């Protein structure tokens, strides 16, 4: 039918326009994202420089656990939220199977949505309105505050995010987060001086905030890129469908002209 094809064509045309605009704005944001990422990357890795140079093995004995997942509040980026989701839920399954209770923070409305009916019973808190604005340090300070005011002093923890590799690839990484107890117990920390419960406590809290900030920056970037390429794919596929439906539209309109002409001719021939 000619009018059906006309309507479907107009729909796919405005959809392709929408996806092209989204690709444009997503690339525009990704510009500033990867501009800000590099100094923040130097920063957030200089923070972990100690837990690297000290080789904190981690608690092999402790029971509870805290699991953070970094995402945004906007879908339509790709397999970002799905990747974080699958890794988080697999990891929770294997930790509860091993006799270790775990409770989970979700930064981003998307991860909370996609994992809430899955593991609501094992869930601490969630945060929203992350992803619209370029994440800053204030984000990390707030998330760390409500991670500490939670009263849930975790044995250990792991943050899960999408390490930005570059414009096309991202890797679901899991960074470790230690507690005061074993960072104090770690014999490697006997080379550092002037340390006791108080200063290690302050340092652990501030490093929690730092690693959350660096992870947010690693995830904001590595989402605008995924969104840009996904919208590129969407616009390309929409234009392919537009071309094929346009072929079918021309075919149908030629057939319509032929059919009406044959009607008129057969009607004239009966006189």
């Amino acid at each position: 039918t000619l009018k059906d094809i006309t309507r479907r064509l107009k729909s796919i045309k405005n959809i392709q326009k929408i996806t092209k605009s989204m690709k444009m704005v997503a690339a525009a944001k990704y510009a500033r994202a990867e501009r800000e990422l590099k100094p923040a990357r130097i920063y957030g890795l200089g923070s972990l420089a100690l837990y690297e140079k000290a080789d904190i093995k981690g608690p092999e004995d402790k029971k509870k656990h805290l699991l953070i997942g970094v995402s945004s509040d906007r879908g339509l980026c790709g397999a970002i939220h799905s990747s974080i989701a699958k890794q988080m839920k697999s990891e929770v399954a294997t930790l509860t199977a091993a006799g270790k209770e775990v409770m989970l923070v979700g930064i981003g409305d998307k991860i909370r949505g996609i994992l809430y009916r899955t593991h609501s019973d094992q869930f601490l808190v969630a945060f929203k309105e992350v992803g619209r604005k370029p994440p800053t340090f204030g984000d990390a300070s707030v998330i760390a505050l409500e991670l500490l005011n939670s009263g849930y002093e975790f044995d250990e923890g792991s943050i899960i995010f999408n390490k930005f590799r570059s414009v096309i690839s991202y890797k679901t990484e899991e960074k470790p987060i230690f507690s005061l107890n074993t960072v104090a117990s770690a014999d490697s920390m006997s080379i550092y001086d002037d340390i006791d419960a108080d200063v290690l406590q302050n340092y652990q809290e501030y490093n929690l905030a730092n690693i959350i900030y660096y992870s947010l920056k690693e995830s904001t970037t590595s989402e605008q890129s995924a969104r840009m390429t996904a919208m590129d794919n969407a616009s390309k596929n929409a234009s392919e469908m537009i071309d094929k439906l346009t072929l079918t539209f021309n075919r149908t309109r030629q057939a319509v002209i032929t059919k009406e002409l044959i009607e008129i001719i057969s009607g004239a021939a009966a006189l």
Binding site: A27, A31, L247, N250, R253, Q254, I257, T258, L261, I265
Partner: protein, 316 residues
């Protein structure tokens, strides 16, 4: 929008000069206003001479206010006045048809008037044979040749419509005058990527010509690719070859610009027609990477590469 009358007049001029061939211009179904405009543009640019016997084109017009019979036989009238030149003077005539779709539709109207039953879409039942009995006379005989440049209108933008689909069976080449290329400031604004030819294969133009043209085509395609990736706004050069080819292709797509003699009164630039081998050689050089030290704007409205390097020197 794009200058097409200029391209037609320049083809007339060149074919008259390079070879010894006169031209005929058929005006099938043409607007009388545009016919008068073309008459005066060809008088101005020297292709038609009102006071001497040095005119290079004969004009045949069947306007839009004429019955379908006229508009249907006017292309044959032009074809006859060209066949005379070919078969009685051994020339290589150039026959223009300012619209072939109006020829098709005039034949359609004629057959409708005669009471015949229409076919697909409404065209005449004799669409293919009517197109064939005309296009088969535009050939290369043992006495001479007639080469036809036929402006094409595609109804409803459907390249599968019976009129353009029955005309494309006879087409041997195709030039596309894009307005986009003209906005870039290239003249003639021939789209170098959407223009096709059936004699492009190496068996006909030789492997040298074929390979030079193939390389130019591939480099222009890759430049449009690198252009849509430069739209990143992150114009960087993480590839040496990428910007190398970017400037090579910009120099090329500006070297595909040329001053036409017929536009010698409007612009001071002199009309430089260039032989085939010199074109092949110049584009071969630009593809081999030689003219890198030369700036970009010395490859704009130039003849062969000799004029290009002369201009490049004269930039200082």
């Amino acid at each position: 929008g794009v200058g097409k009358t200029v391209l037609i007049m320049e083809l007339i001029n060149n074919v008259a000069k390079a070879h010894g061939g006169y031209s005929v211009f058929a005006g099938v179904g043409e607007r009388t206003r545009e016919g008068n405009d073309l008459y005066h543009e060809m008088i101005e640019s020297g292709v038609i001479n009102l006071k001497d016997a040095t005119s290079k084109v004969a004009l045949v017009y069947g306007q839009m206010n004429e019955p379908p019979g006229a508009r249907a036989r006017v292309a044959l009238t032009g074809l006859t006045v060209a066949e005379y030149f070919r078969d009685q003077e051994g020339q290589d005539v150039l026959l223009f048809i300012d619209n072939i779709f109006r020829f098709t539709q005039a034949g359609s109207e004629v057959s409708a008037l005669l009471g015949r039953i229409p076919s697909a879409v409404g065209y005449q039942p004799t669409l293919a044979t009517d197109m064939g009995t005309m296009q088969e006379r535009i050939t290369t005989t043992k006495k001479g040749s007639i080469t036809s440049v036929q402006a094409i209108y595609v109804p409803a933008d459907d390249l599968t419509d019976p009129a353009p689909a029955t005309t494309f069976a006879h087409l041997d080449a195709t030039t596309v005058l894009s307005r986009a290329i003209a906005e870039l400031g290239i003249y003639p604004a021939v789209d170098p990527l959407d223009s096709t030819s059936r004699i492009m294969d190496p068996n006909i133009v030789g492997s040298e010509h074929y390979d030079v043209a193939r390389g130019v085509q591939k480099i222009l395609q890759d430049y449009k690719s690198l252009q849509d990736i430069i739209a990143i706004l992150g114009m960087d050069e993480l590839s040496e070859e990428d910007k190398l080819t970017v400037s090579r292709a910009r120099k090329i797509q500006r070297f595909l610009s040329q001053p036409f003699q017929v536009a010698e009164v409007f612009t001071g630039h002199m009309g430089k027609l260039v032989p085939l081998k010199e074109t092949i050689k110049g584009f071969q050089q630009i593809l081999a990477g030689e003219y890198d030290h030369l700036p970009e704007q010395a490859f704009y409205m130039v003849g062969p590469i000799e004029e290009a390097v002369a201009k490049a020197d004269k930039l200082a």
